[PDB]
Amino acid sequence: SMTKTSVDCTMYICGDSTECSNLLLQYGSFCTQLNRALTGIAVEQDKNTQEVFAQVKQIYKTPPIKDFGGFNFSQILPDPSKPSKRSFIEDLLFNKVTICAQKFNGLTVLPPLLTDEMIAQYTSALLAGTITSGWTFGAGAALQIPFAMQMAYRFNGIGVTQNVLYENQKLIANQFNSAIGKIQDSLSSTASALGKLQDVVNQNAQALNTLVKQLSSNFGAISSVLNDILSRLDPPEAEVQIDRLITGRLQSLQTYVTQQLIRAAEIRASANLAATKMSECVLGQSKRVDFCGKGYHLMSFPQSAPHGVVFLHVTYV
Amino acid sequence: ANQFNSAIGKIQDSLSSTASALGKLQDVVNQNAQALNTLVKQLSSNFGAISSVLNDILSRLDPPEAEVQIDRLITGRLQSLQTYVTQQLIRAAEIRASANLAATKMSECVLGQSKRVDFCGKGYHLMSFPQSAPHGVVFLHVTYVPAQEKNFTTAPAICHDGKAHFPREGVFVSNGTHWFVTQRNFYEPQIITTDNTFVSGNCDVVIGIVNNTVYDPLQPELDSFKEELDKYFKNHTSP
Amino acid sequence: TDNTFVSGNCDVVIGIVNNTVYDPLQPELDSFKEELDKYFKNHTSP
Amino acid sequence: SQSIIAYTMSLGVENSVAYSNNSIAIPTNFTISVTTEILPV
């Protein structure tokens, strides 16, 4: 997802002015199509978040006993001592990736339907169903299976005979547990590790900063401030100067909405890739070559992150 | 056959009862209606000109002023087509994307069988039947969904003679007194045999392994020949 | 003989090599020849 | 007696999985389901 933005072009272009508002009525639907475009984008942000995260209709929960065959999931599963059900790796994800002027200039940001705890709750249900029941809870009734017996089928699916797990289970568990320690260390050490999501936060900040700054742009008028034109000029000259601001501010909204529709298609494409990986890497096992990380796919662990989803792919190399 | 025939009766009733059932195609007609309605409505917009009607400019203004007012309508109407065509290229990318998804579901869901998870409806994909619809395609996806789960006691492997037996296809399950192999997508118990399993390593490395007797289909087939073997020698001692 | 399957003669495969393929039933039948022959050897004594 | 009420949305029905290192659930019966999916072309 990306920041839900609703901009009232009526206040953006003609901020607190009835005289300007009467001039914007001469351009008609230009104001309407801009509000409909941003409303459609905002509605699609909840669609994207639900298509990727809301793939289960039951709130699955983890057992009080953590006997997963030696595999230590404590860094990817919820932490009851915290006010939100985030894991140790999810806390690194939200701590590594991080406004008043925007709302003051008619720019309104809408909250997601699934809050930062609700998205983490679906992630907890995806983790609980995956680790206790394999792919079966996505395709039908949740079938419990011991996790070490689940892994054997995982190895069978990639052309590794089931005896390789049980004859080497202690080494395979040590390799996973050591690799998850390296996931925590890598994500805690590099500031740019979430660069894929930092580009979404940076794109929204640069776009909304351009959208606010363009209110101070003259566009050829004697002033960017509608009150400075109306304080100095009569009804004949003030309308001539205000039309320069209406055309330029109108172009600044069409530029913003065009960039948001084109970026919304990038976020739709990325949410569709995340939806297909949520089904095929998390809710299943993928025989698709290099689709769930480099190597032979065993399984993936989902983790929530700011405006996105993080896949921890486990592969046989 | 009754499950398919009854489910198709429910598809008929659902599609005939709900008005929003084809909402994905109704959004194509609705988007084009709003886009073409805005495209025509904007010809009545002044865009700052003395009138939206081009003849009202030419009926009132000379060659000097009429060109200035006409350029207001040309600029605004030109922005109307640039906005329309931009929205049409952006929507055409959504139609290309949805047609490419439908083309890949036609090839993998209709022309074949898809092992892809959740690509050809919810469940294990059996088949898909195409049906045409206004501006789109409707896929009737037939999927196997596991419905009546029962809990069984299970083991990762069977120990028979100090050797570990692993399942060929299936999982080891207990009815409470006996052990059987069964497939993970339908409970049908089968006798734990040397053909249903494969051997690898001793019985110490498998965590949770259990003891049982593994049936050898060759054992009674050779024991019945051992009694024939003994009667063959007895017969040849007599002449 | 369970790990492999038969198809065609030994001339049609380019690069084929010679080896002995183990028959799990062969020692199970060799034990029947050794039992038969020891019953005959004992039966010559009385 | 009807009115518009406001509530925190439920994410789904709650279900703790009965996980154990010696128990497995197997489907003893199945549903052949026909599901409609509609794509614009």
Numbering used by the authors:
A (entry chain B): 730 to 827, 850 to 1068
B (entry chain C): 924 to 1162
C (entry chain B): 1117 to 1162
D (entry chain C): 689 to 729
Please share text taken word for word from the publication where this structure appeared.
The spike (S) glycoprotein of SARS-CoV-2 mediates receptor recognition and viral entry into cells. It forms homotrimers protruding from the virus surface and, once engaged with the host-cell receptor–human ACE2, undergoes a substantial structural rearrangement to fuse the viral membrane with the host-cell membrane. The S protein is also the primary target of the humoral immune response during infection. A large number of SARS-CoV-2 neutralizing monoclonal antibodies bind S protein, especially its receptor-binding domain (RBD), providing a basis for vaccine development.
